[PDB]
Amino acid sequence: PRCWNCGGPWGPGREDRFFCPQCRALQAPDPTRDYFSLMDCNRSFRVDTAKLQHRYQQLQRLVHPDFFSQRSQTEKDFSEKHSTLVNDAYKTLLAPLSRGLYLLKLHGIEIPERTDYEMDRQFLIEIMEINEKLAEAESEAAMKEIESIVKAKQKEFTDNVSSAFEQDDFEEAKEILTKMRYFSNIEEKIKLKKIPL
Numbered sequence: 075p076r077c078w079n080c081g082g083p084w085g086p087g088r089e090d091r092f093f094c095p096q097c098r099a100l101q102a103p104d105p106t107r108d109y110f111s112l113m114d115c116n117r118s119f120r121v122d123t124a125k126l127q128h129r130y131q132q133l134q135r136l137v138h139p140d141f142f143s144q145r146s147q148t149e150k151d152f153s154e155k156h157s158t159l160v161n162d163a164y165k166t167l168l169a170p171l172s173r174g175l176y177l178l179k180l181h182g183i184e185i186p187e188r189t190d191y192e193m194d195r196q197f198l199i200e201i202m203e204i205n206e207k208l209a210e211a212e213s214e215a216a217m218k219e220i221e222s223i224v225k226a227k228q229k230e231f232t233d234n235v236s237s238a239f240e241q242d243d244f245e246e247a248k249e250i251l252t253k254m255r256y257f258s259n260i261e262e263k264i265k266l267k268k269i270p271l
């Protein structure tokens with residue numbers, strides 16, 4: 075690893091290698107750098123979103139294409155690349171759901187796309203019950219009950235998946251996170267139904 079302007083060696087040291095100490099040029103982003111690192115926090119399901127938002131700004135102060143409009147094409151390139159990554163990381167870590175799923179990827183676990191079959195019975199039952207309820211839900215208050223029901227589950231699940239990580243129990247975390255995916259959809263459908271008011 076070396077600088078595109080100098081040839082200055084990338085030090086085998088600490089992480090934030092945004093600028094070349096030798097020539098001040100904006101460097102190519104490290105593909106290997108995970109989002110928790112880029113957002114300067116521990117690999118953890120638990121994430122301080124006030125801090126996160128602050129980091130997001132610090133970095134966007136450094137790499138956003140606005141500051142590179144008058145600079146070389148190479149720097150414009152990298153400025154755009156970085157700024158995109160910064161956005162990804164931020165969005166990914168901000169949402170507990172995407173955070174959970176991202177946390178699993180690093181721990182080397184890939185997720186099947188909401189595979190409806192690999193699921194257990196009791197949960198399936200819950201899902202078709204919620205469905206029925208929502209389908210039946212036309213009144214504004216019957217609408218509230220579902221929201222409650224859904225949000226009460228969401229909390230329970232967050233607590234659970236938090237534990238799963240605390241214990242390194244990724245097979246469990248993958249389970250619960252696959253569940254949380256369902257309820258997110260249901261949430262979005264409710265919000266979509268809630269538009270006309």
Ligand SMILES: [Zn+2]
Pocket residue numbers: 077078079080081082094095096097098099
């Ligand atoms: Zn350099």
